[PDB]
Design a protein around this nucleic acid. Structure first.
Length: 272
RNA sequence: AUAGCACUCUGCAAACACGAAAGUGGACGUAUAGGGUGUGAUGCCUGCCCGGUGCUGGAAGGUUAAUUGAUGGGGUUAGCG
């Protein structure tokens, strides 16, 4: 709905939020919750390996069933829930046998709906089928790359892929990056779009909003001294060099992919 | 420094970073996501130049490193005068 705050204070002048009503307001299911700790972007040597990471609100991890192993048993959707660990909403599923699991809620799914996984499952949003049994021209999410590993592609809010063709052992899909790639037919996928497609319309409005999410401020390369950065130094403001990273890698147009193993699976590049 | 904006890279065993390796962070995340760079609420806006350096794509035309080893020349070695 794009709710906009009124300018009572300078920090609230440019605050705009997405509002959703169907979300469950209680606590998450305890049996499917475990503790997660902050890392600060440091590895097991104690050094910083990713910059601009720190602080943030305390969070719990939710165990999400990306695999969807339970096959043939129908499940009913209990509720839709907010998830701090991801931009998409999650859905609680109850199976006939009574087992409860979490899944990535597709767009439009609500409490009381029916979902299933298997080769013979009906073609409705939230149903998980092998790519072989999928109609051409379908819009899919949570695509799997390795048999049994689970969904890896098209998981963020609003994500989707287009199934263009399946001939022989391979199916061609267009990804949201604009690339066309081929996948083994026996890899599974899910029907429909993933919810919360308005997430990218949000406007944080102030620095504290990012500090809450755990992003430390970014210092430009020009603001440092020569010992710190290739961009550092000079009397006044001056660039004087082709832009590069702190470790010397050109940052404008230089390609970096080097994996030759999977080059076959790429039909048409996004034209990077 | 900041919220906002824009360029570029990354299809996941991701890019990037630490390490001598094992491995670890990125992330128990998956292009509405992650890294690098510049500008810096908002309003109106953001002209010309690809000659130079860089980057991206193509061309297969000239130059050749290891490698391989044609041919030639030389030392010594036999027998003859």
């Amino acid at each position: 709905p794009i709710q906009k705050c009124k300018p009572t204070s300078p920090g609230r002048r440019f605050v705009e939020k997405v509002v959703h009503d169907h979300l469950h307001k209680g606590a998450p299911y305890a049996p499917l919750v475990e503790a997660k700790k902050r890392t600060g972007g440091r590895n097991n040597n104690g050094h910083i390996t990713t910059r601009h990471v720190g602080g943030g609100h305390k969070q719990h991890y939710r165990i999400v069933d990306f695999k969807r192993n339970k096959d043939g048993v129908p499940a009913v959707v209990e509720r839709i829930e907010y998830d701090p660990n991801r931009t998409a909403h999650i859905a609680l599923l109850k199976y006939a046998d009574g087992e409860r699991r979490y899944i990535i809620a597709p767009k439009g799914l609500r409490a009381g709906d029916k979902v299933q996984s298997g080769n013979d499952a009906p073609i409705r949003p939230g149903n998980c089928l092998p790519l072989r049994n999928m109609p051409i021209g379908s819009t899919l999410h949570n695509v799997e790359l390795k048999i049994g590993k689970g969904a890896q592609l098209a998981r963020s809010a609003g994500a989707s892929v287009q199934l263009l063709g399946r001939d022989g052992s391979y199916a061609i899909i267009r990804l949201r990056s604009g690339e066309m790639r081929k996948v083994h037919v026996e890899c599974r996928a899910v029907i429909g779009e993933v919810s919360n497609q308005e997430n990218n319309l949000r406007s944080l409005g102030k620095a504290g909003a990012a500090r809450w999410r755990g992003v430390r401020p970014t210092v430009r390369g020009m603001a440092m001294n020569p010992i710190d950065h290739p961009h550092g130094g000079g009397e006044g403001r001056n660039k004087g060099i082709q832009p590069v990273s702190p470790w010397g890698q050109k940052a404008k147009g230089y390609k970096t992919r080097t994996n030759k193993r999977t080059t076959k699976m790429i039909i048409r590049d996004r034209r990077v």
